[PDB]
Design a binder for this molecule. Structure first.
Ligand code: AGS
Ligand code: MG
Lengths: 239, 238, 228, 209, 250, 199, 232
């Protein structure tokens, strides 16, 4: 057994292996999510496809239950083992207390798994950040995120990945109340958001909405070809 | 200094520096003075505080009905040996149905604290235990140190600025083996006014006294019942 | 170059216990005041973004029905100590059929605070206030990353800790009331925080001898603010 | 203080070139790698007198490229080892924070591995303006194409985009590379306008090794 | 004892980690493997390295390893590290068959091994594997599949990929000559001999220098056929006949 | 002690069970449900002692739901039934063997409908019809009397009607009500909770 | 006590395992040894010179049998060899207790080389400093395999290990063909060990072991003198 303290304090009060892992998040591909009052909409950008690969094994939006979706950034090898440990816990909740898992509960499991893992012996911390999105019982759509140090934290709109400060500055000057008016109008905020990021001009973006009673339903590159037309068409006439 | 890092490493002079640095930790805590008569064992402590509204940190603890201790150093390792101290007293009382003798208790501590002074990546216990108790042989004053070396003594004083208290105890220890409980205590109280700056001494909220006695169970006196003992001292000569 | 985690200084203290004392100077500030009418206890939130939901974060959390808490420094490892305190108050109720006193909660946590090493891995970087009403009345305690706890009367912990303590020694006296202790704390928090004071940047909680642990919410809270 | 840093080939030296292009003041250039001398002690004194002479002249900004060189490799021809590296770099860093008259000097920086050199130099006051050098974007890679393709009588077949995406993280030097290589290909056959298959062979040669 | 520890698990101050990037640096050299599919069948073209005149040429294969009864793998990198992985996912497929009485799907065999490979990069203070490897196979859910593993622990589905020494030159030409779903298992073989004509610096394409194995679906068989050294060279010269025709007529 | 039944047709599987949760001599609950879903086309029907029928059958249910999330598709009824047989057989020679009797019903898009049979010793049997409980002794003889491999689902219900009316003539237990399912290409469908009025 | 539980063999920034590269240097400075299979059996021949006349040459042996039909020689350092002999003696027994059959020579090298790879990754150990040559005649056809400290293995027709191994491989390439008997391969194994020995190659400076379909055996110095006579 390898017993060695990896994460230790700095002489001024930092945890260096934590904040080095935050920079591995800061060059993964961008993931943006907002919530509507009835339909949540989150979609990663930079699919970065090379037209010789299977398109389904590269997906970064998975589901933990029927109601809880999840996107991430950072490095993918650490991601899909946190996900598989979350799938067991949200299934073991049902063998216990009968209701399906509330979206706040599954964030506390991931965040507490991630903290104690910056505390044990001989373990580097995880290098991912996540967005947990769900519409729980009694239909209240909400989302969260998870820092690699393990601080779960709710939001109304957020973005992580490479180029996340510029998108977060873009949303606060754009997030009104009437932006979440229609289920097709909230999507026009996300498609306007990631187009203000690393190119992805309809060819590298994959939105995925959830209408509070469905599962995740990814629109194929025909409505995004339709939406990016009309989002740029309104931009064409006003300016 | 590459010989200054781990407890395992000997110096080329032959003095392990990690043990010598734990002696610096016991010199940081406030002073306390223990002494004994023919029939009594009295230890007197001097508390400290952080602000004027925060309370004073206690130092005298109750191990058993005939054993009490006084700590100096970091308080977390003090409670670690204290919960070991209480456990070794009541199981001997569970097995043999007798009070565990004091001189046989301290040798369990000396074997307890010597173990992390020899392994790898194990700190010593920075603590300043003065022990007062009863065998069937009368009172006993014992002190320890983080070098796992316990001392049999008749009056000692440890903590910050304690050398001035030892000089007072040497020139008055011919009188200690005769007096009753009253001026045995205020012999020790004249040692704590020795180890202070020349303006504040004994304002009834920073001093504590614990006595075990030949027909007297170990009793701690705190900040109101100190005042009968504390009256009857002369002014500081200047 | 690299020491172990368990090494004394030549001045004798430690290395990483003393480094963790520095880490709670980055946390948000928090004020607790003990009054014989009851314990009031406040904090700021340090809201970063307008898009952020404000109520998802918390600093006041309850341990039992008669004991509240307040955390500073890091947050993610504070939740480990909170869960050990909640279990400890329920094991004491299960085996003794009574309420654990406020002091005996604190030493049950403070024994846990210095247990790292290389067998069986770093000290916790939080600082806690424990406000409660046991049978000796209202109490107020303060622990350390070093595991050293002591009863305080008006303790201010956070990034603005030493600036607030000086302004708090002048207004505190032993015969306060709870209605003026609540007002006296928000005068101090109005100085030390960055943004303006409103009903969302701060939150309070008071514990009484009569009723149990009560946390204020954004309806009864701003009557203190508009009548500051 | 002023400093650049980034991957090998982004614009830290060329940028300095344009800087001087605009300037109307004194200017010098030297490489840290040459600072080491097979003897002992000289290099330091070299630094001293060099700073002196620079300061003595005029409105001036001197620049050294790739100091990290002196902190990365080691040449067996050097008499000792770090036993002079340390002292030389030390006196160096001092000579930018001399208690004496600092004079009219400002300094730029340009290193590929900044993370590993002595952070002591990075002290505030010695170095002030600290700027990153990133990977330019493809939409700008098109502009680089335009740059190194404006004043050449190319062939009409230029579809630059299907050439931009070859190396997913290529550099602004690679543009010039492909361009001049294709031109050479043209010159071999004495042709004039540079056709697309020339771009093909270019990407194949310059990159695949 | 902490002076001798090399800390093969920690991050670097720039954010990335050095140990697996040194391994993927070593995965470039020492070997060449590639695969292709568009229709019924899938192939693995691999180039032999030790071509010395004193060897027995046995064990039916050199870098091809039959894993299941209907899938196989081609490996690259440290050959000794490869022998531990190959007989590790060989019984991952068997403990699946013990548990469900059904052959394992080709994708979740890859994810099972790439979690064991990921764990050494993450804790334990242990040297990771410098091994990347391909996966061909068939299942009833999606048919013919083609995967690729990396020493970091992340996989991916593909259609044609090389992990050779000049693998970037091969991929640049695979996306220059390709067709989605129309490359039958004769045009892919002619394309396979075209690609390793380029990346192999030893010219003239010695038939003993390469190995080609095909996986075709016969009704209840899934025939994995390592084609012999009598039909390689006629496929070699078939590439040679057309290139003298295409060069002279252009 | 209880009674469930397994008629399997050309493109459907007709299953039914009772609704009585028993006790010492009384019946605690008259509308109990012995029916456990795992997928959109796989059911599970468990009979046995008190604790093991509940906890084993939901242990299997969390492993089948997990297989769908890890892969995106469901188990076949052949593989789902054969995963259960491994779990009894491994836990048979243990300190706590489960004592349950069960039969699994499933539809697939490749091999069509399927019915499997098990006991408390974990022996599989691909059967066209089966039954557990003491009512199986009464009711198997009507069922092979009238079974055709090409039987339509309308007359398969009235065969089940005939198979239960004899069970309320010469069987000493009460058993008034019976819950009925049907499985096809469209998934699980609830049929009428057929019963006999004791008023 | 306990161990270290960390690998002291890491990747270089040039991507080479340096400790394995150093272990091959210790193999190359060993005693020279050649091995030749020819159509009915395998010949293993080594070179064993005592440092002085005081040593008892009939005490230790370079050529060791593993079972009835498998022999094994080395070229490296001494005490590492006796460890993985006793390991390989045991591995041939657990195959036999399961299957009631003598182990194939291929499956032994599958399991001996798995030990050497496992030993160059685990915590706190330096790799072995030996290379092996393994012979045997399973199912008529003979076999000749060579392992290395990295854990790989090969299938040779004829090869040389030890000092001047690059000269022996050129000598065997100009000598060996497909068609030789066992007694011819003995004569050319002495002819390739004479390239690097001293002046006196007596009946006790060398050690030769053969396989047949009759099984592995090791030559006594009587007939080794007869093969050494009328040689070169
Ligand atoms: N962003 C760019 N725009 C236009 N040309 C560029 C750009 N980046 C590089 N180049 C070209 O490539 C050359 C390389 O730029 P340099 O200034 O040498 O970069 P550098 O990062 O300082 O190089 P190193 O690391 O010292 S080798 C320039 O002289 C230009 O010809
Ligand atoms: Mg440059």
């Amino acid at each position: 057994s390898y017993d060695r303290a990896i994460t230790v304090f700095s002489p001024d009060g930092h945890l260096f292996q934590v904040e080095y892992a935050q920079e591995a998040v800061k060059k993964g591909s961008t993931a943006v999510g907002v919530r509507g009052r009835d339909i949540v909409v989150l979609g990663v950008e930079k699919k970065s496809v090379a037209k010789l690969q299977d398109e389904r094994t590269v997906r970064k939006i998975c589901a933990l239950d029927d109601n809880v979706c999840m996107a991430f950034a950072g490095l993918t090898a650490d991601a899909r083992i946190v996900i598989n440990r979350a799938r067991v816990e949200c299934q073991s909740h049902r063998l216990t207390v009968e209701d399906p898992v509330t979206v706040e509960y599954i964030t506390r499991y991931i965040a507490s798994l991630k903290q104690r893992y910056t505390q044990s012996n001989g373990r580097r911390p995880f290098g991912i950040s996540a967005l947990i999105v769900g519409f729980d019982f009694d239909g209240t759509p909400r989302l969260y995120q998870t820092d690699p140090s393990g601080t779960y934290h709710a939001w109304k709109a957020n973005a992580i990945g490479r180029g996340a400060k510029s998108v977060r500055e873009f949303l606060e000057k754009n997030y009104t109340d009437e932006a979440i008016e229609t289920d097709d109008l909230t999507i026009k905020l996300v498609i306007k958001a990631l187009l203000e990021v690393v190119q992805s001009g309809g060819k590298n973006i994959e939105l995925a909405v959830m209408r509070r009673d469905q599962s995740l339903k990814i629109l194929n590159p025909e409505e995004i070809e339709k939406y990016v037309a009309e989002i740029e068409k309104e931009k064409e006439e006003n300016e | 200094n590459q010989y200054d890092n781990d407890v395992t490493v000997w110096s080329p002079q032959g003095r392990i520096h990690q043990i010598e640095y734990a002696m610096e930790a016991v010199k940081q805590g406030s002073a306390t003075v223990g002494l004994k008569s023919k029939t009594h064992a009295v230890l007197v402590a001097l508390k400290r505080a952080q602000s004027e509204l925060a309370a004073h940190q206690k130092k005298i603890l109750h191990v058993d009905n005939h054993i009490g201790i006084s700590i100096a150093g970091l308080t977390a390792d003090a409670r670690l040996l204290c919960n070991f101290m209480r456990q070794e007293c009541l199981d001997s009382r569970f097995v043999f149905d007798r009070p565990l003798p004091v001189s046989r208790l301290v040798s369990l501590i000396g074997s307890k604290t010597q173990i992390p002074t020899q392994r790898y990546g194990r700190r010593p216990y920075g603590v300043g235990l003065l022990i007062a108790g009863y065998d069937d042989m009368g009172p006993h004053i014992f002190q320890t140190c983080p070098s796992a070396n316990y001392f049999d003594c008749r009056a000692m004083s440890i903590g910050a600025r304690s050398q001035s208290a030892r000089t007072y105890l040497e020139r008055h220890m011919s009188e200690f083996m005769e007096c009753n409980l009253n001026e045995l205590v205020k012999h020790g109280l004249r040692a704590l006014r020795e180890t202070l700056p020349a303006e504040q001494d004994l304002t009834t909220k920073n001093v504590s006294i614990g006595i075990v006695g030949k027909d007297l169970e170990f009793t701690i006196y705190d900040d109101d019942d100190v005042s009968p003992f504390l009256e009857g001292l002369e002014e500081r000569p200047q | 170059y690299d020491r172990g985690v368990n090494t004394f200084s030549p001045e004798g203290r430690l290395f990483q216990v003393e480094y963790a004392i520095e880490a709670i100077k980055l946390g948000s500030t928090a004020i607790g005041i003990q009054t014989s009418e009851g314990v009031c206890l406040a904090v700021e939130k340090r809201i970063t973004s307008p898009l952020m939901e404000p109520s998802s974060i918390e600093k006041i959390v309850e341990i039992d029905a008669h004991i509240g808490c307040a955390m500073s420094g890091l947050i993610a490892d504070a939740k480990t100590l909170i869960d050990k305190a909640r279990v400890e108050t329920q094991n004491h109720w299960f085996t003794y059929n009574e309420t654990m006193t406020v002091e005996s909660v604190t030493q049950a946590v403070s024994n846990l605070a210095l247990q790292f090493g290389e067998e069986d891995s770093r000290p916790f970087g939080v600082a806690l206030l424990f406000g409660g009403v046991d049978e000796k009345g209202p109490q107020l305690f303060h622990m350390d990353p070093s595991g050293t706890f002591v009863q305080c009367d008006a303790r201010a912990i956070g990034s603005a800790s030493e600036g607030a303590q000086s302004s708090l020694q002048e207004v505190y006296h032993k015969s306060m009331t709870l209605k003026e202790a609540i007002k006296s704390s928000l005068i101090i928090l109005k100085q030390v925080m960055e943004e303006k004071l409103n009903a969302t940047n701060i939150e309070l909680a008071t514990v009484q001898p009569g009723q149990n642990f009560h946390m204020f919410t954004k309806e009864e809270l701003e009557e203190v603010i508009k009548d500051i | 203080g002023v400093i650049l840093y980034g991957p090998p080939g982004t614009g830290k030296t060329l940028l300095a070139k344009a800087v001087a292009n605009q300037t109307s003041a004194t200017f010098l250039r030297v490489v840290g790698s040459e600072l080491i001398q097979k003897y002992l002690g000289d290099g330091p004194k070299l630094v001293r007198e060099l700073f002196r002479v620079a300061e003595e002249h005029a409105p001036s900004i001197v620049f050294i490229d790739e100091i990290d060189a002196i902190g990365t490799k080691r040449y067996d021809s050097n008499s000792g080892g770090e036993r002079e590296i340390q002292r030389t770099m030390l006196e160096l860093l001092n000579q930018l924070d001399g208690f004496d008259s600092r004079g009219d000097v400002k300094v730029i920086m340009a290193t590929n591995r900044i993370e590993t050199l002595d952070p002591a130099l990075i002290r505030p006051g010695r170095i002030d303006r600290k700027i990153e050098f990133p990977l330019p974007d493809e939409k700008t890679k098109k502009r680089i194409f335009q740059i190194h393709t404006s004043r050449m009588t190319l062939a009409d077949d230029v579809t630059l985009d299907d050439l931009i995406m070859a190396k997913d993280d290529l550099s602004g030097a690679d543009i010039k590379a492909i361009c001049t290589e294709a031109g050479l290909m043209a010159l071999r056959e004495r042709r004039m306008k540079v056709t697309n298959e020339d771009f093909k062979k270019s990407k194949e040669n310059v990159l695949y090794k | 004892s902490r002076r001798y520890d090399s800390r093969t698990t920690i991050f670097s101050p720039e954010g990335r980690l050095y140990q697996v990037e040194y391994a993927m640096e070593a995965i470039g050299h020492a070997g060449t493997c590639l695969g292709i599919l568009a229709n019924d069948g899938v192939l693995l073209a691999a180039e032999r390295r030790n071509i010395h005149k004193l060897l027995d040429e046995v064990f039916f294969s050199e870098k091809i390893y039959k894993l299941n009864e209907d899938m196989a793998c081609s490996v690259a990198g440290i050959t000794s590290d490869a022998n531990v992985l190959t007989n590790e996912l060989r019984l991952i497929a068997q403990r699946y068959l013990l548990q469900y009485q059904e052959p394992i799907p080709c994708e979740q065999l890859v994810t099972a091994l790439c979690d064991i490979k990921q764990a050494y990069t993450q804790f334990g203070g242990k040297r990771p594997f410098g091994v990347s490897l391909l996966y061909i196979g068939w299942d009833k859910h999606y048919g013919f599949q083609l995967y690729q593993s990396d020493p970091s622990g992340n996989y991916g589905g593909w259609k044609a990929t090389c992990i050779g020494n000049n693998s970037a030159a091969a991929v640049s030409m695979l996306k220059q000559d390709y067709k989605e779903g129309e490359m039958t298992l004769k045009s892919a073989l002619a394309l396979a001999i075209k690609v390793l004509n380029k990346t192999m610096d030893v010219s003239k394409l010695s038939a003993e220098k390469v190995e080609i194995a095909t996986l075709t679906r016969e009704n209840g068989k899934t025939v994995i056929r390592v084609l012999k050294q009598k039909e390689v060279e006629q496929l070699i010269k078939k590439h040679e006949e057309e290139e003298a025709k295409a060069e002279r007529e252009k | 002690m209880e009674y469930l039944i397994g008629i399997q047709g050309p493109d459907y599987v007709l299953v039914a069970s009772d609704r009585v949760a028993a006790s010492n001599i009384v019946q605690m609950k008259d509308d109990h449900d012995k029916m456990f879903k795992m997928s959109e086309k796989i059911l599970l029907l468990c009979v046995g002692e008190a604790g093991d029928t509940v906890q084993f059958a939901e242990y299997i249910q969390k492993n089948v739901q997990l297989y769908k999330m890890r892969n995106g598709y469901e188990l076949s009824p052949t593989a789902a039934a054969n995963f259960t047989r491994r779990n009894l057989a491994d836990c048979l020679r243990s300190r706590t063997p489960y004592h349950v009797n069960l039969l699994l019903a499933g539809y697939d898009e490749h091999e069509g409908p399927a019915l499997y049979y098990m006991d408390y010793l974990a022996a599989l049997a691909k059967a066209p019809f089966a039954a557990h409980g003491y009512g199986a002794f009464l009711t198997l003889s009507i069922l092979d009397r009238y079974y055709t491999p090409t039987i339509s689902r309308e007359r398969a219900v009235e065969l089940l009607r005939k198979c239960l009316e004899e069970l309320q003539k010469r069987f000493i237990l009460n058993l008034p009500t019976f819950s009925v399912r049907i499985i096809d290409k469209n998934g699980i469908h609830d049929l009428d909770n057929i019963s006999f009025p004791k008023q | 006590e306990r161990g270290y539980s960390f690998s002291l063999t890491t990747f270089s920034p040039s991507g080479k395992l340096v400790q394995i590269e150093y272990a091959l240097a210790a193999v190359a400075g060993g005693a020279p040894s050649v091995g030749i299979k020819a159509a009915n059996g395998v010949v293993l021949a080594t070179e064993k010179k005592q440092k002085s006349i005081l040593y008892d040459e009939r005490s230790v042996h370079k050529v060791e049998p593993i079972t009835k039909h498998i022999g094994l020689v080395y070229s490296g350092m001494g005490p590492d060899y006796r460890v993985l002999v006793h390991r390989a003696r045991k591995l041939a027994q657990q195959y036999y207790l399961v299957y009631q059959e003598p182990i194939p020579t291929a499956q032994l090298v599958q399991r001996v080389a798995s030990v050497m790879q496992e030993y160059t990754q685990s915590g706190g150990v330096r790799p072995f400093g030996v290379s092996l040559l393994i012979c045997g005649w399973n199912e008529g056809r003979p076999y000749l395999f060579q392992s290395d400290p990295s854990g790989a293995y090969f299938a040779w027709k004829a090869t040389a290990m030890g000092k001047n191994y690059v000269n022996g491989k050129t000598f065997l390439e100009k000598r060996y063909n497909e068609d030789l008997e066992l007694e011819d391969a003995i004569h050319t194994a002495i002819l390739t060990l004479k390239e690097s020995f001293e002046g006196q190659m007596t009946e006790d400076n060398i050690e030769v072991g053969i396989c047949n379909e009759a099984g592995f055996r090791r030559l006594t110095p009587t007939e080794v003198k007869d093969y050494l006579a009328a040689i070169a």
